[PDB]
Amino acid sequence: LVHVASVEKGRSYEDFQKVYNAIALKLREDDEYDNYIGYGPVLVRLAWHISGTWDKHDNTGGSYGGTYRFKKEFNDPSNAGLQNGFKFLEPIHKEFPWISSGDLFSLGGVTAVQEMQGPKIPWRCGRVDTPEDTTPDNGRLPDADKDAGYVRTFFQRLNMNDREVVALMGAHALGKTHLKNSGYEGGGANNVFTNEFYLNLLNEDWKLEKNDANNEQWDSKSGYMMLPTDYSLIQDPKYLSIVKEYANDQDKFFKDFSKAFEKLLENGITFPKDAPSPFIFKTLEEQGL
Ligand code: HEM
Ligand SMILES: Nc1nc(N)c2ccccc2n1
């Protein structure tokens, strides 16, 4: 099963920078969402969940086909809450109807990371919407109540290795869990992309508690939380070494996350040899906008 990137007809860097800018300006304007977190975190989670359905064995799922727009995927319990992200992106799509759905969802995540002061994430266009019958079944995204061996095995399906897994999970610096969506509860409100997930893992005094949904999670006296899968990154000695590396080197973390996130967003896509190079979008700040 081959998915060949096909550039939206006649479009170039400038076109996609306009789309980036519209998302970024909306991110800035819609500041009240989720107790003043704004939409950045949910857009990162959306880009992950539309990509994380991928299966390397048969090239099903993945970001290419934009299949989250179909009911089966939109209504995956693992995607609860992501409708907010979809609704945020709706006016962007109305304005730029030429961008594919996979391109828009993935670009939303790139734009969110960058606008939250994260690393630059090179991004490629050319995802093409595919029909409803190409929508992957529910159940391909990961459970949060498991251990390091689960995480490791899970991510092999997405062709990610230990360093790529630990880097990607640093996105849990962002936003929060919501009991109604996932059965986990959080009290953070962070919308700045940093390596603090790792620092918090290493520095807090974690206690294994049950939340109001009767699920276990790790909580600190200072009010932080970790999912069991987050905490597994310090229980496993291979993950732990990498957590320490990123806690001690912000730039290395940024560079590794950028690589891994781009790869996650591009899994399953064949880029023809004469495709455009990846685009690196300027932030609103860099443009003086
Ligand atoms: C073992 C893998 C992972 C598990 C089990 C997991 C689990 C979760 C859960 C349970 C939530 C809360 C959903 C809600 O209650 O609203 C969440 C949110 C989030 N996840 Fe993950 N996650 C994983 C990996 C990733 C990756 C790879 C990324 C992106 C690189 C990511 C980005 C996010 C972000 C940004 C949020 C916050 C959304 C918000 O504030 O609305 N996660 N994740
Ligand atoms: N601050 C914070 N901490 C986590 N462990 C987390 C996990 C999943 C999603 C968002 C998160 N936000």
UniProtKB/TrEMBL annotation:
Q: What is its EC number?
A: 1.11.1.-
Its main localization is mitochondrion
Is Iron tagged as a keyword?
A: yes
Residues that bind heme b, according to the entry?
Answer: R45, W48, H172, K176, H178, N181, S182
Q: Where in the cell is it found?
A: Mitochondrion intermembrane space; Mitochondrion matrix
Instruction: Give yes or no: UniProt keyword Iron.
Output: yes
Biological process (GO), any one: cellular response to oxidative stress
This entry's Gene Ontology molecular function terms read:
cytochrome-c peroxidase activity; heme binding; metal ion binding
Swiss-Prot/TrEMBL keywords: Heme, Iron, Membrane, Metal-binding, Mitochondrion, Oxidoreductase, Peroxidase, Transit peptide, Transmembrane, Transmembrane helix
Question: What does UniProt give as GO cellular component?
Answer: mitochondrial intermembrane space; mitochondrial matrix
Recorded catalytic activity of this chain's protein: 2 Fe(II)-[cytochrome c] + H2O2 + 2 H(+) = 2 Fe(III)-[cytochrome c] + 2 H2O
Give every Plant heme peroxidase family profile domain span. Answer: 99-289
- Describe the task this protein carries out: Destroys radicals which are normally produced within the cells and which are toxic to biological systems.
Q: Share what the entry says about its subunit structure, partners included.
A: Forms a one-to-one complex with cytochrome c.
UniProt lists the family membership as follows:
Belongs to the peroxidase family. Cytochrome c peroxidase subfamily.
- The protein's name is Peroxidase
This protein's species is Saccharomyces cerevisiae (strain RM11-1a)
Task: Tell me the part of the parent protein that is shown.
Answer: 72 to 362 of 362
